[PDB]
Amino acid sequence: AKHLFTSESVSEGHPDKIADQISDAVLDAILEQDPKARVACETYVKTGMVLVGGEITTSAWVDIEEITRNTVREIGYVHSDMGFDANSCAVLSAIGKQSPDINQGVDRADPLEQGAGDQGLMFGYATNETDVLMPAPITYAHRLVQRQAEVRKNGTLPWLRPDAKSQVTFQYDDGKIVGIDAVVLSTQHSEEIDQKSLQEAVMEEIIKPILPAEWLTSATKFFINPTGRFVIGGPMGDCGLTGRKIIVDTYGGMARHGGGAFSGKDPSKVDRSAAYAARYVAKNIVAAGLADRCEIQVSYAIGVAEPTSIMVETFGTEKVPSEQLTLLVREFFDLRPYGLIQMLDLLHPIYKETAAYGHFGREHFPWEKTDKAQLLRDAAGLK
Amino acid sequence: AKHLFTSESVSEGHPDKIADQISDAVLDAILEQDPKARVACETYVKTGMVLVGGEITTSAWVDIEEITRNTVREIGYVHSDMGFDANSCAVLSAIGKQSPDINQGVDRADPLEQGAGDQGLMFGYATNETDVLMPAPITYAHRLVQRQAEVRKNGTLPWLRPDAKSQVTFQYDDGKIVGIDAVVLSTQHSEEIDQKSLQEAVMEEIIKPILPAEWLTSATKFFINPTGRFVIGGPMGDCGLTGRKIIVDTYGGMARHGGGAFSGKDPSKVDRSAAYAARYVAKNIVAAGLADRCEIQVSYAIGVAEPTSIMVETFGTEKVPSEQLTLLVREFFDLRPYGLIQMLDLLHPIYKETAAYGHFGREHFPWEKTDKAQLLRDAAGLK
Amino acid sequence: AKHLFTSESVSEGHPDKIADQISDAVLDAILEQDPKARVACETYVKTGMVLVGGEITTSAWVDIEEITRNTVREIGYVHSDMGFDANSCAVLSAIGKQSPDINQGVDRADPLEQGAGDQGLMFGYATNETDVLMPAPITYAHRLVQRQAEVRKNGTLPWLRPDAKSQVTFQYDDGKIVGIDAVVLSTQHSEEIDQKSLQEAVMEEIIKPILPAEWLTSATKFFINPTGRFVIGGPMGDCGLTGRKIIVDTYGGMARHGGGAFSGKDPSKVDRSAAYAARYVAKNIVAAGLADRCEIQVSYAIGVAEPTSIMVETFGTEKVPSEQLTLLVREFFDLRPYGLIQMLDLLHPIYKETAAYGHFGREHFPWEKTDKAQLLRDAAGLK
Amino acid sequence: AKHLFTSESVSEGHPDKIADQISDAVLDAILEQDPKARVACETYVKTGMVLVGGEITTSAWVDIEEITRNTVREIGYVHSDMGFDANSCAVLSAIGKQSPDINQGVDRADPLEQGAGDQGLMFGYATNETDVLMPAPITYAHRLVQRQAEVRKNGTLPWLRPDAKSQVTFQYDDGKIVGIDAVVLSTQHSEEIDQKSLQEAVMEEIIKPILPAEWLTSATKFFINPTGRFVIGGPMGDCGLTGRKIIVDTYGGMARHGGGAFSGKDPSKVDRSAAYAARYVAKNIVAAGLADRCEIQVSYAIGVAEPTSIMVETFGTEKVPSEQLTLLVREFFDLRPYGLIQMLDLLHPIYKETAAYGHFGREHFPWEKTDKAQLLRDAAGLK
Numbered sequence A, B, C, D: 001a002k003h004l005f006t007s008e009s010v011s012e013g014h015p016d017k018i019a020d021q022i023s024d025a026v027l028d029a030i031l032e033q034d035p036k037a038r039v040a041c042e043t044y045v046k047t048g049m050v051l052v053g054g055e056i057t058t059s060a061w062v063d064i065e066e067i068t069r070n071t072v073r074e075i076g077y078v079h080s081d082m083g084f085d086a087n088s089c090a091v092l093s094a095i096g097k098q099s100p101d102i103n104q105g106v107d108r109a110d111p112l113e114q115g116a117g118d119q120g121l122m123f124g125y126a127t128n129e130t131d132v133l134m135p136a137p138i139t140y141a142h143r144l145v146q147r148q149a150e151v152r153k154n155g156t157l158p159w160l161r162p163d164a165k166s167q168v169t170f171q172y173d174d175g176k177i178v179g180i181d182a183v184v185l186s187t188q189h190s191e192e193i194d195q196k197s198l199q200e201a202v203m204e205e206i207i208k209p210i211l212p213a214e215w216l217t218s219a220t221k222f223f224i225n226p227t228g229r230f231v232i233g234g235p236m237g238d239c240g241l242t243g244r245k246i247i248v249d250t251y252g253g254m255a256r257h258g259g260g261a262f263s264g265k266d267p268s269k270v271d272r273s274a275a276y277a278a279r280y281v282a283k284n285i286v287a288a289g290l291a292d293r294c295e296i297q298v299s300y301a302i303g304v305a306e307p308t309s310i311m312v313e314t315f316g317t318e319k320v321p322s323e324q325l326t327l328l329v330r331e332f333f334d335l336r337p338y339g340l341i342q343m344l345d346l347l348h349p350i351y352k353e354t355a356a357y358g359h360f361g362r363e364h365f366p367w368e369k370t371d372k373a374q375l376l377r378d379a380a381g382l383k
């Protein structure tokens, strides 16, 4: 009955995230100019530099330094005092074009037959634990780093620096949340404020306002800047890389994962598109009330348009025998490369925004919408 | 009852893996000279270069170019013909030292009290699906890319190139394997051989000898180099990065994951050490026969030595009420930073070997050993 | 009366020249699209990479990788066998925009008033030692490396590699050439041919056909691949950088030099335009017969249109008192930034061609033409 | 009789010089540990990075980041406010080992026979225009940038930034100096001070105290920060590269040059050692009173110990027929690779100090000493 589950999240000022933002910042710029572009951009970030590389084959014309400097700038690093500075950092580029060998298998004569960008498996997930049908732990962790960033930008706590990470562990009894045992919040700061003050301030401004007072009890344990000092952060304190936040980007470790990153790749890359499409049916199934929680999983083969595997897991919480529930899935949605792109209209520059604070949970994203639910209901005991 | 599950693996010639190998190749070298070194090494690999960076604080003296060139060389790329060459590629370095701010929370006066290298959560897993208590899908996928590499090196198929990826999906009925529906195998090759021949050869030499003939039926579907052409590969066709094989490195997507990569980090980094220790108790629990399959999860807080969370999931397959099963865990093993390192003796250069073909399944690894099982048995109905 | 003077040259396959070529290759491409572009391109070349950086502010849209790969390709390195490969090498870019602080001083309201791109001094030179009014030592050294490159491309000596350097020292008595004391010729080669053969072959194919048989006597000493082995070359054997061939680029050490490189910069950069204009008047003066040999020198001040200094040196060989000869100079030519560009029509992509084998001596270059001579004659005892 | 000659210099804060300093800073460190090390270190410096590369073969163990960060730190860039920061900039490394092919020709069995590091020609120079037998123009220009640097460090003009360049043109009549026509002084500054103030301040603190009041007349023209604004400088405003200050490093353009840079290379490199040895005999000749001014020139052939060419030019100012003056040269000094190093005791870390403000003119340098003069006198009309 009782058990503990822990999830974590990172601020937009976290090295790894900086990468993602940059990566997806480039794609957006590119896509704005050419929707059918093929972008596979990987970014490396350290002490005084930013490396934007990979393979890009587009007709668009973009400025990497500008997109980069501007992207970091917005993140927050604008002075050597914080360790990194959009204005004075180095911006390197090693961007080649996509291999034709791969391309022949992706873009074929007939657009519909067009194949998967690569082989691989993706996991979709949905749960009635919350309104947005997302697990609770990841939702609150995200809220924590997000708050910290907002209290920093609005000038509430001017001594806060971009870099920050958050961890929370919930108490789960009878399969439901009963509270929160431990809370972790690490945030970069200036040489001007003291630990205690900082700690005491983080509680009032960042934790207390975000964590439901009900789940907080005299038992909860708070871990704030444990090493006792976090003045050095960002790429200086930790190397940032693209696609190294795979889990916080998705469901916090509650659901499963195939190993494919999101940022830097255009929709023809199943790692991102098939993933989104998977959250789409999973969420839609639960909204449709066909199950309380279900994990979906598709797998593909490079240059091949038709999915190599599909499986729905409802953990017994289903309301219609999986059978019809699985035959309904391939019945209603098109998981073929050039079916999901139209299904969710992925040919637009809407990904940068997705690079920090979770790819799921934001109802305004095309894959968060639940329109097929009611119709997915009709296919089984409408009433 | 019936459902499909897919996993995947990559050859030691895959860009991402090249990174990991390099990353862990540097640490080993360093560790050989200094076991208590603090290594956080991230590698970026593309068309004609290799970028080794991150933060390293050691008293050891190593040669990055030599370790790198040699590491790639062994992988296989030794001619421009294959796209990359250990002898003629560029070797770049951006390696700083570890932030003292982090260090004060890690290495404290008392070695026992020494804290976790970072915050985060890790997932351990074990299953009686196989002798090594590893899931089957990931085990066979690894075997496929591994075979390909060996048939290449031994000269059986001299036209094979280092770069290769493998995907397999099993049929699961009644919770057990009944067969394999689809098989995917992509391998780089020379301009000298044709697709058909290649395909036909891959079956005889790499697939047929590795996949159990029982699970192969007239239904199984084989996908071999689908785009129809894979002559261009390695960093030229795809950017390689450290820690982007998170899932194939562990359990193939069968179990869960927290988001911590392994390669490039010394044991004081819970991402690698708490992870290993988690596979250790999970495996040891199943071996101890206390459960058919169980997932373990620990989470930590930077600078803090005592785990912030622990949870054992046996999916009902447990044989002793979880209660005593969870109280036994913290009873037998020490998950504190400086407890797992001694527990598994992680202060040695034994990681490079772990950078390709799974971190689990190799019984000779200290975390694969099951010595505590029988003793973990004594603590519950010995007999 | 008697004395020895030595000059040297380098093949288009030399690391430093590779840089130059690349640098000026980028400019041309840019200029083709925008003649008034401001290009300050510096290239770094090593083992498996090429670094193109600096500051560029243009409205043009160019592809660095393509321009670079193609430029190296043409030079000759196309296989790992030779140490570098246009197809498999890395291409990096760190190009920012020109500082507006400099720009306000360069481009002012009135185009004529437009100022010098930087401060500095430049040396022009001319001599009746040869038809093209160039010194002899530098002329023959260029010819040597140029021949080696041609005998390599035409397939005469297929085992020759791109990298090569040439050195010649002439005997000067009575102020004229009497012969050549020592000849140096170093060229990269394949593991297939032996030293002796190579040496013997270099004489017949490269040295004997280029050096006048009259100046070659039993005294002359030949130095061919002295270390006894030159199989390793190019960026692998030596780091290439832009603007490190300052002297072979001009007059071989016979005349003076101020320190400004040529490649990578647009004409608004006095280092290149004022230099060219200087060879222009010096050559024109000797052609006009006003002197047998004269060195010119101008100096500028950033943001300032009017030259800070001008001086003509005729080494006594003048035929009209220097006085009128110097008053004639500023009388006939316009050395103001926006006067020399029109004077020589420098807003065109004509520089790559100038990046190897000398910037002077090629009569088809705009600064090699002598049209003002006859008119420079009228201004002094026409007849 | 009358004519104008211009020279220039650059502060230790100039991008190019930053490179040199870095380059020679690495050598010294290495040499300190191993005098017979072979170092060919080329540095590239831009906006937020520093690239140290080339080929180094030593038994020494050094820290590039530390040597670099510290070297830049001392120069002065320590805040993003000035555009570059030693603490937060990137430090990259691409250092391979020296090609054995070259080595066999350099270090042979017999140490005496040991050969020249490369082919090439070098120019030495001396003049009685000044006590240190250096030309005047380059001496004063160096003094100008050197003053600016000192008035910045001592806090006299706290708003001064590291980057600065200086230009001076002298009036030469009857072959002697009569005065100075134009003065150029460009220095980077803070957003806090205005142009007029700055200009007025630069005259009092930097120009007036350094330029002889005799040579300054109502005619002299002063050019101070002409573009009207120099707030942006350093690698941000201009790319820094090693060996691009060839001329200011030596004689300001008064004497000739062969094209060989000094910084980053050990003494076995004739570009630096033969160069120094050339200033040594030229200076010593004039000190010996054998000529008022003389230019020396040697040339070498890779792997070859014996110089390929030697020539002394006294411009008629000699006092003993050149003949005996040239036979005296090879009589007194040893220009063989392994003769000059002992001659000047070059196996020591004494080069960093030589990377800013001229390689000649500092009488405490081993090549600035004149001990052979009196003995060079005995060999010709002692009395």
Ligand SMILES: C[S@@+](CC[C@H](N)C(=O)[O-])C[C@H]1O[C@@H](n2cnc3c(N)ncnc32)[C@H](O)[C@@H]1O
Residues within 6 Å of the ligand: A014, A015, A016, A163, A164, A165, A186, A187, A225, A226, A227, A229, A230, A231, A232, A233, A234, A237, A238, A239, B038, B039, B040, B055, B098, B099, B101, B102, B117, B118, B119, B302
């Ligand atoms: C703990 S660091 C990685 C370990 C590090 N590379 C090392 O050398 O041990 C990972 C993240 O922790 C956070 N961090 C950095 N310094 C910290 C500190 N002093 N206290 C708490 N968190 C810190 C940052 O957001 C950083 O991305």
Ligand SMILES: C[S@@+](CC[C@H](N)C(=O)[O-])C[C@H]1O[C@@H](n2cnc3c(N)ncnc32)[C@H](O)[C@@H]1O
Residues within 6 Å of the ligand: A038, A039, A040, A055, A098, A099, A101, A102, A117, A118, A119, A302, B014, B015, B163, B164, B165, B186, B187, B225, B226, B227, B229, B230, B231, B232, B233, B234, B237, B238, B239
């Ligand atoms: C499909 S690629 C990544 C997509 C690519 N960056 C793009 O621009 O679309 C990922 C992996 O697939 C494999 N691969 C590369 N070229 C391939 C081809 N032509 N056919 C099959 N697999 C290929 C390699 O092992 C490579 O690391």
Ligand SMILES: C[S@@+](CC[C@H](N)C(=O)[O-])C[C@H]1O[C@@H](n2cnc3c(N)ncnc32)[C@H](O)[C@@H]1O
Residues within 6 Å of the ligand: C014, C015, C016, C163, C164, C165, C186, C187, C225, C226, C227, C229, C230, C231, C232, C233, C234, C237, C238, C239, D038, D040, D055, D097, D098, D099, D101, D102, D117, D118, D119, D302
């Ligand atoms: C002699 S190397 C400079 C010294 C080198 N950086 C080192 O590590 O000693 C410079 C040039 O000499 C030429 N070179 C390289 N290897 C050579 C060899 N084995 N014999 C003759 N010339 C060679 C190339 O053109 C190369 O760019």
Ligand SMILES: C[S@@+](CC[C@H](N)C(=O)[O-])C[C@H]1O[C@@H](n2cnc3c(N)ncnc32)[C@H](O)[C@@H]1O
Residues within 6 Å of the ligand: C038, C039, C040, C055, C056, C097, C098, C099, C101, C102, C117, C118, C119, C302, D014, D015, D016, D163, D164, D165, D186, D187, D225, D226, D227, D229, D230, D231, D232, D233, D234, D237, D238, D239
């Ligand atoms: C004029 S810049 C070279 C041209 C530049 N690459 C461009 O993009 O036009 C070279 C040097 O001039 C100096 N400098 C830079 N900005 C300056 C300014 N605004 N006024 C005067 N000197 C300046 C610095 O010492 C710098 O290294």
Ligand SMILES: [K+]
Residues within 6 Å of the ligand: A238, A239, A240, B040, B042, B054
């Ligand atoms: K890292």
Ligand SMILES: [K+]
Residues within 6 Å of the ligand: A040, A042, A054, B238, B239, B240
């Ligand atoms: K990639």
Ligand SMILES: [K+]
Residues within 6 Å of the ligand: C238, C239, C240, D040, D042, D054
């Ligand atoms: K070099």
Ligand SMILES: [K+]
Residues within 6 Å of the ligand: C040, C042, C054, D238, D239, D240
């Ligand atoms: K520059």
Ligand SMILES: [Mg+2]
Residues within 6 Å of the ligand: A016, A239, A240, A241, A244
């Ligand atoms: Mg990371």
Ligand SMILES: [Mg+2]
Residues within 6 Å of the ligand: A118, A119, A120, A259, A260, A271
């Ligand atoms: Mg993938």
Ligand SMILES: [Mg+2]
Residues within 6 Å of the ligand: B016, B239, B240, B241, B244
């Ligand atoms: Mg990858």
Ligand SMILES: [Mg+2]
Residues within 6 Å of the ligand: B118, B119, B120, B259, B260, B271
């Ligand atoms: Mg982590």
Ligand SMILES: [Mg+2]
Residues within 6 Å of the ligand: C016, C239, C240, C241, C244
């Ligand atoms: Mg060079």
Ligand SMILES: [Mg+2]
Residues within 6 Å of the ligand: C119, C120, C259, C260
């Ligand atoms: Mg200059």
Ligand SMILES: [Mg+2]
Residues within 6 Å of the ligand: D016, D239, D240, D241, D244
């Ligand atoms: Mg320069």
Ligand SMILES: [Mg+2]
Residues within 6 Å of the ligand: D118, D119, D120, D259, D260
């Ligand atoms: Mg040279």
